[PDB]
Amino acid sequence: KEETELIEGEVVEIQIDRSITGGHKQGKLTIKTTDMETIYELGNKMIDGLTKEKVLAGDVISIDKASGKITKLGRSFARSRFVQCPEGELQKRKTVVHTVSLHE
Amino acid sequence: KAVVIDDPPLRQTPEPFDEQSAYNPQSPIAIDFGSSKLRAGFVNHATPTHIFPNALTKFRDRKLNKNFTFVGNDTLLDQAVRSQSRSPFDGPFVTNWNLTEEILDYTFHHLGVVPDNGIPNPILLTERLATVQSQRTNWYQILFETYNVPGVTFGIDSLFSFYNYNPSGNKTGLVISCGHEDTNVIPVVDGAGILTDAKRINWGGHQAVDYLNDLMALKYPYFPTKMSYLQYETMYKDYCYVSRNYDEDIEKILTLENLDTNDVVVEAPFTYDWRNSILHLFLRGPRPHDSENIHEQHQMHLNVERIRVPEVIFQPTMGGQDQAGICELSETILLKKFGSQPGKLSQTSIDMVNNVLITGGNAKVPGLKERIVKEFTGFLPTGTNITVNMSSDPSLDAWKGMAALARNEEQYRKTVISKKEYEEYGPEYIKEHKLGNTKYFE
Amino acid sequence: RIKETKEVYEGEVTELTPEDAKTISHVIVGLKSAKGTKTLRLDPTIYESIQREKVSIGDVIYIEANTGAVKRVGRSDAYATEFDLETEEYVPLPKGEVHKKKE
Amino acid sequence: ERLLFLRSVGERNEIGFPSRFKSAHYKKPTRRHKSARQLISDENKRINALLTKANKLVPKATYFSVEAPPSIRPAKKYCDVTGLKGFYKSPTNNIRYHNAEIYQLIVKPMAPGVDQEYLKLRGAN
Amino acid sequence: TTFGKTTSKFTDLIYSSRNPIKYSLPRLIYEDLILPNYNNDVDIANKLK
């Protein structure tokens, strides 16, 4: 049994500023749940991990900070795959139970 | 059970005066001109004979039509005369001078002095690190003209406490001063204060009680009773302490197990479960809250601020000052100054580390010395001998430095400024000795 | 049966300054724990192993003296607020000494 | 008695205008108030004037060289309501907070203008 | 593949192709079997052999 901290929510607005040569990049990310909204100042490698796996506004994503893995769960309920907006706290600790065979 | 605080009780007996028959005209007089308190007394004793708060009231009497004057501990006789008290200081400086002149007249009267043509005793005086020429010009003016003093000298109170606890005058150490309106770290090499490396943090006890004022006003916006400076000062005094490591304390300061023991309830004077709410545990503690109770509407809970109010001297960004803390100023002083490569301490740094001195009135807060020892052990090389010295009451060390410098007549005379030197060289003249300030330029 | 020893330096990197003479002569590394700091001189091979594991200033590393193995535990909690969101994991300082010896 | 007790201290601590303690020659001048704001600025323009006259001198120990430099380590972020560790910041009024309960009960429904009184403590206004 | 796709003065096309099948491994097996630490003898046995 192990615990890992993950962030899941709906993307509201992504601002990314680049230079002429693209050496240094600055960014902000506005994300929300049904109970709270926040804004995050981003670093370079998270900006590169958001540009790869193209994230637009209105996408529901899950972010693992320690590994840098971001998975798109889907799109939310704005027609203009479809999943619901997450609820509760943005920063959550989930305990995952593993079972590994001795052959593995 | 909640405790109830009030204003401090007024002094029943008036402050007396020393006998005028014991006065002699060649003994120096020592004055600790602090922003919070005044300490004065003759040199031949070890402790002050006159400690009073630095305040004055101009009582106007209706029936007599006379403007009476109450100074110091005479202001602690009536509530209305205590609440009208006005200090000469506005910030770290002195801005009015008639108040200080009449305060000095009062303390000359209560010292038992029978003088003529001004004062016949040399004076021992404090001055702030890197002062304005306006301040020492006005000090020279009022002393050498109004009081007809034979000779004056100036110094910093932290260096004077360092001389008090190291009376040889040739030692090496580091002085950390926790004052009313500022916090200083001054490096001392061979008994001389190296003031080109001294650093000042604009925070003291006044800003701490103001921080507790603002935090209590913003935590209870519907509190009906308005509290004065003295009750918040005493809540700073009995229920505030320095944490051993501030990061792990705030992660469990609002749990139910910690709040059963480390929660203080304070009562102001007058005539969907709650265990899963961190906001209810922040506001009304670990007990059920009755919103209709008269007694529970005059209650404030001190849970998180107790370690948050004294933490500003370590992280000054919390209080609004973009400055380094005590530990990082000590870091740069002991690791990248006085000829020390980071990773290789020089000999000078070792003698400063072995004689760290904490002084000042705001060192009364518990846990300060152990936190300083822990951080110093954190950033120094392994096996470095660390010694931190704290007085029994660190607010009186400046007057003991007065008396220690005055009893030693050999190195007294290197610091005195008499009438002839002041008249020859004018007000723009600095006596560069080990235990005072230095020239503005090189 | 072989009798061996284990010698480990662990802590937060405070100084990583290499000096040459296009070839490096040595590197001096400074390590910090909760019980103090200890500075070390290192050969170019372990500097190349440090460069392979992408170690910068502020990272908690693991050095074994006999074999020269270098492991990066992570960045320290003192640099956890340089950005609001980051891809790095933040581990606390070691509470013991930097130098540990064991037979 | 209570109204007459302060008169005793008044009649034991009085000093006349021809005072015993001061000198015979006085020539007392008039003085401006000169509060704590203007002393720093006149000192600053004094050293700036002396430096410009010297440029047409390196400082050693002044008020503006003694003061502590800003930090090089990154500063810690805290909740503006409770003082605990702040994970999130509101995108509207820029106020840090701890969890969703604090946000919904304090940060969301608060009046305009209380943002500046919350951010005045850390000097962020 | 599961890759970074678009849900619709240059553009970035970065390689992001993955496999839909995920093999999940606990941290304990890594930290006590493959990584060296103070309580295991990976590097000592590696040097000896």
Output the 3-class SS for chain A: CEEEEEEEEEEEEEEEECCCCCCCCEEEEEEECCCCEEEEEECHHHHHHHHCCCCCCCEEEEEECCCCCEEEEEECCCCCCECCCCCCCCEEEEEECCCCCCCC
CA distance A1 to A95: 7
Residue E49 CA to chain centroid, in angstroms?
27
Write the residue in B14, B131, B442 that is nearest to D60 by C-beta.
B442
Closest CA to B130 of B189, B199, B203, B74: B199
CA distances from A41 to A72, B254, B330, E21 (A): 20, 28, 32, 33
Can you say how many angstroms the Cα of residue B33 is from the centroid of all Cα atoms in its chain? 11
Specify the pairing of strand C70-76 against strand B93-94.
unpaired
Angle between helix B157-165 and B397-407 (nearest 10):
70
| Cα B199 to Cα E28: distance, rounded to the nearest angstrom | 48
CB pairs under 8 A between C and E: 26
Instruction: Test E7 with A100 for CB contact under 8 angstroms.
Output: no
Q: Which chains touch A (3 or more CB pairs under 8 A)?
A: C, D, E
Helix and strand counts by DSSP (H, E) for chain B: 15, 19
For residue A40, the chain D residues in CB contact (below 8 A) are 89
Which residues lie across from B199 on neighbouring strands? B185
Inter-chain contact A41–C83, Cβ cutoff 8 Å?
yes
Instruction: Kindly state the tokens that stand for A79.
Output: 């027609």
d(CA B259, CA B256): 5
State how far the Cα of B172 lies from the Cα of B87, in Å rounded to an integer.
36
Question: Given in angstroms, what resolution was this structure solved at?
Answer: 2.6
Does A52 contact E4 at a Cβ distance shorter than 8 Å?
yes
Backbone breaks in chain D (C–N > 2.5 Å) follow which residues? Answer: 56
3-state SS class at C34? coil
Amino acid occupying residue C53? E
Please, are residues B15 and B110 in contact by the beta-carbon 8 Å criterion? Answer: yes
Q: Is the distance from CB of B259 to CB of B303 less than 8 angstroms?
A: yes
Q: For residue B339, is it left (φ>0), alpha (ψ between -120 and 50) or beta? A: left
Residue B302 forms beta bridges with which residues? B264
- State how far residue C1 is from chain B, nearest Cα, in angstroms: 35
- Nearest chain D residue to B319 by CA distance is D122
C40 pairs with which residues across the strands? C29
Beta strands C36-42 and C59-64: pairing type? unpaired
Tell me whether residues A35 and D100 touch, CB distance under 8 A: yes
Pick the closest to residue B325 from B382, B397, B393, B375 (CA basis): B375
Collapse the DSSP code of B369 into the 3-class scheme (helix H, G, I; strand E, B; otherwise coil) and give the result.
helix
Locate tokens 């599961």: which residue?
A: E2
- Residues contacting residue A78 through CB under 8 Å, at least 6 positions apart: A58
Nearest CA in chain D to A37: D90
CA triple A31-A33-A38, angle to 5 deg: 40
Cα B258 from Cα E49, distance rounded (Å) = 53
Q: Do B344 and C39 touch (CB under 8 A)?
A: yes
Tell which of D71, D72, D76 to mutate to test the C interface (max C CBs under 10 Å): D76
Residues of C in contact with A52 (CB under 8 A): none
Phi, psi of B298, deg, nearest 5: -120, 35
CB contact under 8 A, D91 and A38: yes
What residues are paired with C71 via a beta bridge? Answer: C62
Three-class SS state of C72:
strand
> Distance, in angstroms, between B385 CA and closest chain C CA?
12
Helix (H) or strand (E) holding B184: strand B183-189
Strands B29-33, B37-42: pairing kind: antiparallel
The set of residues, in sequence order, having a beta carbon less than 8 Å from that of B227 and lying 6+ positions away, is B216, B268
Provide the angle, in degrees to the nearest 10, between the axes of the packed helices D36-55 and B133-141.
Answer: 110
Experimental approach taken: cryo-EM
Residues facing B53 on adjacent strands: B37
Distance CA D38, CA B182 (A): 19
State how far the Cα of B174 lies from the Cα of B186, in Å rounded to an integer: 6
Tell me which residue has tokens 């994503």: A61
Cite the DSSP H helix spans in B42-177.
79-83, 98-109, 133-141, 157-165
Alpha carbon distances (Å) from C15 to B67, C55, C94:
68, 11, 17
Which positions 43-62 of D are in contact with C (Cβ < 8 Å)?
none
Q: Name the CA radius of gyration of chain E, rounded.
A: 20
Task: Report d(CA B8, CA B76) in Å as an integer.
Answer: 9
Q: What is the CA radius of gyration of chain D?
A: 27
Measure CB to CB from residue D77 to each of C78, C79, C81 and give the nearest one. C81
- β-pair type (C70-76, C59-64): antiparallel
* Residue given tokens 């008020």 in the structure block: D63
On whether the CB atoms of residues B345 and B381 are closer than 8 A, the answer is yes
Residues of chain D contacting B315 with CB distance shorter than 8 Å: 75-76
Of B410, B417, B398, B403, nearest in space to B152 by CA = B417
Token pair of E33 as six digits: 């079997």
Give backbone dihedrals phi and psi of C19, rounded to 5 degrees, phi first: -130, 145
CA distance D11 to A72: 86
Whole-angstrom distance, CA of residue B209 vs CA of residue B228: 11
Indicate the residue of D89, D90, D104 with minimum beta-carbon distance to A35: D104
Give first-to-last CA distance, chain A, whole Å. 17
Would an 8 Å CB–CB cutoff place C85 in contact with chain A?
yes
| Min Cα–Cα distance to chain A from D104, Å | 7
* CB–CB contacts below 8 A, A to E: 26
Contact C82 D75 (CB under 8 A): no
Other Cβ atoms less than 10 A from the Cβ of D103: the count is 20
Q: Do D74 and C84 touch (CB under 8 A)?
A: no
Find the residue in A nearest to E6 (Cα). A54
Phi-psi region of A77 (alpha: psi -120 to 50; beta: other; left: phi over 0): beta
d(CA D9, CA B3): 35
Measured between CA atoms, the residue of chain C closest to residue A67 is C87
Q: Which residue among C83, C87, C89 places its CB closest to the CB of A49?
A: C87
Give me the DSSP letters along C34-77.
TTEEEEEEE-HHHHHHHHHTT--TTEEEEEETTT--EEEEEEEG
Cβ of C78 within 8 Å of Cβ of D73? The answer is yes
Nearest CA to CA, how far is A91 from chain C (Å)? 12
Q: Which residues of A touch C84 (CB under 8 A)?
A: 39-42
Contacts of A30 in chain D (CB under 8 A): 91
Instruction: Record the tokens describing residue B266, joined without a space.
Output: 């304070």
* E44–C66 CB contact, under 8 Å: yes
- Number of CB pairs, chain B paired with chain D, less than 8 A apart: 188
Q: With contacts defined as CB-CB under 8 Å, which chain C residues touch D73?
A: 78-79
